[PDB]
UniProtKB/Swiss-Prot annotation:
Membrane-protein topology: Lipid-anchor
Phenotype upon changing residue 118 to S: Abolishes S-nitrosylation. No stimulation of guanine nucleotide exchange
Pfam families reported in the protein's UniProt record: Ras
Full protein name: GTPase HRas
UniProt modified residues of type N-acetylthreonine: 2
Effect listed in the UniProt record for changing residue 89 to C: Found in a patient with severe fetal hydrops and pleural effusion; uncertain significance; decreased activation of Ras protein signal transduction
EC number: 3.6.5.2
UniProt-annotated glycosylation sites, renumbered to this chain: 35
N-acetylmethionine PTM positions: 1
Functional summary from the UniProt entry: Involved in the activation of Ras protein signal transduction. Ras proteins bind GDP/GTP and possess intrinsic GTPase activity.
Length: 166
């Protein structure tokens, strides 16, 4: 049909797995089990096109990060996730983007910046800060909550729409 390989990256605990599971399985994972490397597949209609999403959920914990680069290499677009209550995860985004560019050997890779956990109130990253970072990269910024499902479909579908502009 039409396949899009999406890779979700970002610091440990920011909600990469919760986001992916909300999209694919329609429930919220409350517990924290660090990921090594997991894959999901779903057929969905996006803007009138039937397509197959292959989503790679990657490790954010350094200790679990072995060989992540080898998984990142096959990606067609990347969700770069931080949590709005985790300033360090936002600062880390630069390093994840740089890794993406290294493994893709390109400065032109479809990406979306995602600020997750927007249901929480201990915000330390303001929307405008993230919008500015995204603007510097030439990509959209979207806020999500894996818990309430706010923005979850939007983030992944926006990434598909970015891949289509490549
Ligand atoms: N309130 C709230 N909690 C969230 C949200 N997303 C994830 N969490 C919580 O944050 C914790 C970590 O989520 P998880 O998805 O495992 O993070 P991760 O980025 O996949 N971690 P890792 O890189 O180690 O695999 C879990 O307790 C999960 O319930 C969110 O949008 N809101
Ligand atoms: C480490 C954060 C800096 C952002 C650079 C694009
Ligand atoms: C501090 C996170 C950087 C990730 C690059 C492998
Ligand atoms: Ca649950
Ligand atoms: Ca390389
Ligand atoms: Ca390469
Ligand atoms: Mg995970």
């Amino acid at each position: 049909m039409t396949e899009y390989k999406l890779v979700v990256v970002g610091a440990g605990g920011v909600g990469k797995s919760a986001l992916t599971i909300q999209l694919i399985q329609n429930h919220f994972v409350d517990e924290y089990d660090p990921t090594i490397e997991d894959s999901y597949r779903k057929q969905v209609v996006i803007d009138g096109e039937t397509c197959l999403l292959d989503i790679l959920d990657t490790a954010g914990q350094e200790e679990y990060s072995a060989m992540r680069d080898q998984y990142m290499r096959t990606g067609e677009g990347f969700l770069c996730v931080f949590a709005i209550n985790n300033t360090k995860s936002f600062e880390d985004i630069h390093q994840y983007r740089e890794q993406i560019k290294r493994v893709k050997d390109s400065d032109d890779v479809p990406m979306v910046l995602v600020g997750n956990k927007c249901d929480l109130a201990a915000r330390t990253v303001e929307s405008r800060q993230a919008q500015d970072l995204a603007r510097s990269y030439g990509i959209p910024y979207i806020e999500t909550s894996a818990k309430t499902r706010q923005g979850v479909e939007d983030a992944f579908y926006t990434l598909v729409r970015e891949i289509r502009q490549h």
